[PDB]
Amino acid sequence: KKVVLSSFSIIGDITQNIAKDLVTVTTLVEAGNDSHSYQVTSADAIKIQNADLILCNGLHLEETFMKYFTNLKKGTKIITVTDGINPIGVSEDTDSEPNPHAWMSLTNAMIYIENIRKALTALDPSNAKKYELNAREYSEKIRNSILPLKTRIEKVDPEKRWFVTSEGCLVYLAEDFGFKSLYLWPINSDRSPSMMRHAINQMRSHKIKFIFSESTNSDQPAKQVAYETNASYGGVLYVDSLSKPDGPAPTYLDLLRFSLTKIVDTLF
Template structure:
């Protein structure tokens, strides 16, 4: 539903704040900074060798309430473009961008219909984790290609070809796993996590979602949150509960112990790992997270 082609609509859709000036003179490779590691990996796949891509936040960072350091500011100061997610994910970004001055930026979630957060102090605001759904990922890739083309028009053909190939890789990674999830018995199709970061994936995989807290910027693991999830697990006989890599696994393990559900392990959503870790790329993140969910729901 959300997919669009690169030419025309994608180029027209990406808001390029501050990029009214002529495109970058190609005396060097353009430098592009992203707000977190997932976007950096996606951008590298689209840019190829034509641009240098760096992430402001490091692998494993909690990006919702990230506090930029002076070295982060220095590292991004000579960037020609910053790519961010939007949807209120990077709460720290606006001040960071002001500190950098008049630096162009593009919002990669533009064109995606957001799912609203359903609880907590952020109720009704966009759930920012749209990159976890296949159709949304296609839009991210197109928006990256459009932003890079606006910065470096001479590279349009290369960016478009790279984007086409990368979209195919993402589809080939996700589609078989999504089909497996949709084929599970309906009673097992529950996804219980610490953060409500998997709404887009749950909708895509036809899973019913339950979580302790809606977003990591909110209160985490309160007695009321734990009790609500414990009651739901018992009512629906949910077999497994998961946690995420950037938060403590203690609340999820507590719930598993109290209800008799299995603890299914760690899911990755907000950040990639170091290169020698389990999810050094976005494709790895999609694959490992989906496989962990499927194993937990199938084996429990």
């Protein structure tokens, strides 16, 4: 039985929905750890040796630990599951490092699924028909949950078309749904007084009503910005990790559904 190692919780969960126990799906950066400067342990090195296939986000998400994906089993490939997603830069002034949060998008969910289906199929071609069926079922499951939220979101008045967050975690969502985005820092692990100043100025300027924080960072900056802008703190979104199993976002679908529900509930 083949072993497929995903770099972090969100990719592991996607892969499990496509493979459904045809392969053993493992995860390196488990829920509640952050990929940036993640410490690869000796146990983790066993996971890496066992892998017949390694599934990464790319977009620099794994940059601090790519070096551990060495001395690999013969034949074991590293697949970048964001292949075909046009990157959005960490420059809020659009050349720069890529923003890794491509999974926060309905369109991109379908691409992650397709790239994983394709890699599973190449790895394990005798199960092609099964991965094919499973990938379609899963794609449909996500569309069925998430599209009605999009449909509601799209009714927002053009002037209120802003997703404002702490980390730059919704830039791909913004692009997918036709919203502008504002944030305080591009990626959590640093930080910038002038980016805060800019956000405050932009919110005042466009009468933006809400700003969110996220499940792996502090709410303090968002609340401070809300105060300085006469805006409201919108609460906590789940974007960078699955939650714990008894939390609100224990699967990738549940993560998308929770966060986009909270967004639409805040906008309307």
